[PDB]
């Protein structure tokens, strides 16, 4: 019955990475992130964006004698071969939106290539708790069409 909206479900992030420097918080290893609902009229041409929502990857127990910096990379399916930082939806079949994916922006506003090897801007660590912030947002690759939108990605943390 939806003829007018991309109707955001969740983007689901998983990232079980173990390192001596810090522990990934248990609330960060398997998280969702709701984007909600956008009229297709607002995503009518390639490059249009909407509905940026924040999420964080929290590191606990950091020890700066082990690492002074951290960064995160994300892995997922590109929506097409010429849009390497736009995550395909889990489905573009009947009932799901087409011509729209999801980008993961780091704390400097840069979209991250979804190759598991393109690291965010670094957090300069303090001992203890460190919160690395991101956003997710919709990104149109053409005239978006209506339907459900859900996506999935995994993440890794690199320390130095």
Numbering used by the authors: 3 to 162
Give the original sentences from the paper that presented this experimental model:
The FimA subunits of the pilus rod are single domain proteins of 16 kDa with an incomplete, immunoglobulin (IG)2-like fold that lacks the C-terminal β-strand (G-strand). In the structure of the pilus rod, the FimA subunits interact via inter-molecular donor strand complementation, in which the N-terminal extension of each subunit, termed the donor strand, inserts as a β-strand into the preceding subunit and completes its IG-like fold. In 2010, Sukumaran et al. discovered that the FimA proteins from the enteroinvasive pathogens E. coli, Shigella flexneri, and Salmonella enterica have a second function besides formation of homopolymeric pilus rods; soluble forms of FimA, independent of FimC, act as inhibitors of host cell apoptosis after pathogen internalization by stabilizing the interaction between hexokinase and the voltage-dependent anion channel (VDAC) on the surface of mitochondria. We showed that all three FimA orthologues investigated (FimAECO, FimASHI, and FimASAL) were capable of folding to an alternative, self-complemented, monomeric form of only marginal thermodynamic stability that likely represents the FimA species that acts as an inhibitor of host cell apoptosis after internalization of the respective pathogen.
FimAECO, FimASHI, and FimASAL were produced as reduced, insoluble proteins in the E. coli cytoplasm without their N-terminal signal sequences. All proteins were refolded in the absence of the chaperone FimC under oxidizing conditions to allow the formation of the single, invariant structural disulfide bond. The purified proteins were crystallized, and their X-ray structures were determined at 1.5, 0.89, and 1.69 Å resolution, respectively. All FimA orthologues crystallized as self-complemented monomers, and all structures strongly resembled the previously reported NMR structure of the FimAECO monomer. Specifically, all three FimA monomers showed nearly identical immunoglobulin-like folds, completed by intramolecular donor strand insertion in a parallel orientation relative to the C-terminal F-strand. The global folds and registers of parallel donor strand insertion in the X-ray structures of FimASHI and FimASAL were the same as those observed in FimAECO, and all three structures showed high surface complementarity between donor strand and the rest of the folded FimA domain. The overall pairwise Cα RMSD values for the three X-ray structures were 0.30 Å for FimAECO/FimASHI (113 Cα atoms), 0.51 Å for FimAECO/FimASAL (154 Cα atoms), and 0.57 Å for FimASAL/FimASHI (110 Cα atoms), and the only minor conformational differences were restricted to loop segments 15–20, 37–45, and 89–97, and residues 51 and 81. Evaluation of the data according to the two-state model of folding revealed that all FimA orthologues proved to be only marginally stable, with free energies of folding at zero denaturant (ΔG0) of only −5.5, −8.9, and −7.2 kJ/mol for FimAECO, FimASHI, and FimASAL, respectively.
